[PDB]
Amino acid sequence: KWTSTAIITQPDVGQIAGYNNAMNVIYGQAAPKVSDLQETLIGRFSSAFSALAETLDNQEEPEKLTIEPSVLPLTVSYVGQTAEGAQMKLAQYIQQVDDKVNQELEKDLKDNIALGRKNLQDSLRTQEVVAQEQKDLRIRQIQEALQYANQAQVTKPQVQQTEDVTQDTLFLLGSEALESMIKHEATRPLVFSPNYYQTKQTLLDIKNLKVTADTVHVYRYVMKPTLPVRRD
Template sequence: MSKDTNAAPGSTERTQTEQIDLIDIIQQLWAGKLIISIFVIICVVLGAAYAFTAQEKWSSVAIVTLPDSGQVSAYTQAMSVLYPGASPVVHDIQLGFFNRFQVGLAALSMQLQNQKAKNALTSKALSKDDPDQLLISYVGDNATEAQEQLKSYLSKVDSSIAKDIDSDLITNIDSRIEELNSDINSMEQMAQKKKELRLKVLNQALVIAEQSNIKTSQLQNLTGITDDTLFMLGSNALNAMIKNYKNSPLPLSEDYYNAVQNLLAAESIKQDKRILSTFSYIMKPDLPVRRDSPKRLIILILSVIIGGALGAGYVLLKDMFRRNR
């Protein structure tokens, strides 16, 4: 078979031209290597100046989750005293505490942003599958400052929210005490009225017995005696009953004594010194070992690349203008 020799010369010429152009560019760059080196040096100096003078950024990280049952035990106990049989379960209390902690943390983060603070406090769920685990980070000017400031912020939010929760609890206790006092007073008044009514019945029976000149009991069997037949007991027995009943305590129900017991318990927990916490640590704020920025090695490498590119561009443009004149 014969080869097509018509297209070969043109293709060869283009290849040779491209090779010549590439060689020409390399020669131009080699000839301008001093200028390129100057550009590289300038960019490296500028990059190094930034890399070694820019403010460093270090991130400390902590992982937190729901408070332990022991951290909310004082609150749980108080709620069981205030609302026996109807107090919330421990997990609901833990979840409520942690949700309030997250709200407080978000508020502090927003406050720092509004103040245009140079360092950021951020938080996010550790994973979508477990939203009750929170990853919190703080960016500081150095490793120790980042760690200590994150500890301080977490403690600040925890103390503030715990104080608010305790204040709300005191309000609930005061309300419960007021409610119990009202119930106790109502039951005492009702018992007093019952006692007065009973004395009135006994006195009326005594009047009838005296008018009937009945001094001793006329009843053989005391079972089934009613208010209408009390006078049959005789004036002697009725006088003794009235005297004893006047000095007897109020006829109070079991509900009354339960209310008094609950009142004493509520007054007792109001005086308690509660230690509450709204979260627990999975990982305490760490001491970062690598800074976030500046990345000095990357900056220097980019400086060399940028300097070389600028220098090469300058050399090639200068040669192009020279040829066009």
């Protein structure tokens, strides 16, 4: 005959900043908005908590632990034999559910990150295969221009303006430069796209993410466990 009671709610954004941020480095636009994130944390603690209460009943001698909307804050309650009491125990549990929910979120996050990392590396790899194809096409275009250059007898550059050169205009660079570009084909750097660099960027941000105990939080107190005055 001694109930201790506390009131909990969604974690604050500052307390979740780093998680939200990590969810952004990994998912970019896809990452959840922060409010949905919060609603998902508390809601996950709630679930683990009821389950604990069910685990609590299934004992040689059952203990009584409650969870239900404060009306949307939530209200939890433990029934004790002494005043403080139902406290300590309640406190001891909030902390427990907190811990099992964290450990699990952190492990999931880290799994997330490693898979991202691995998918990013692969994106980089396949993107290079494409860029490599583009260079190869370029060398072919140059090989063709060399034929137009020789036949038009253009050996030295005829073009007095920078800009892009295209298949029909490469010959203006003249046979001497075009031969050099073919001879040195192997050492022509690949040209990588903006999307390629984004991939790298993200891969750098991902590798940087550090998961610690301060990373995620699941709930915040609006009232810590109470020491009840009037038993039952």
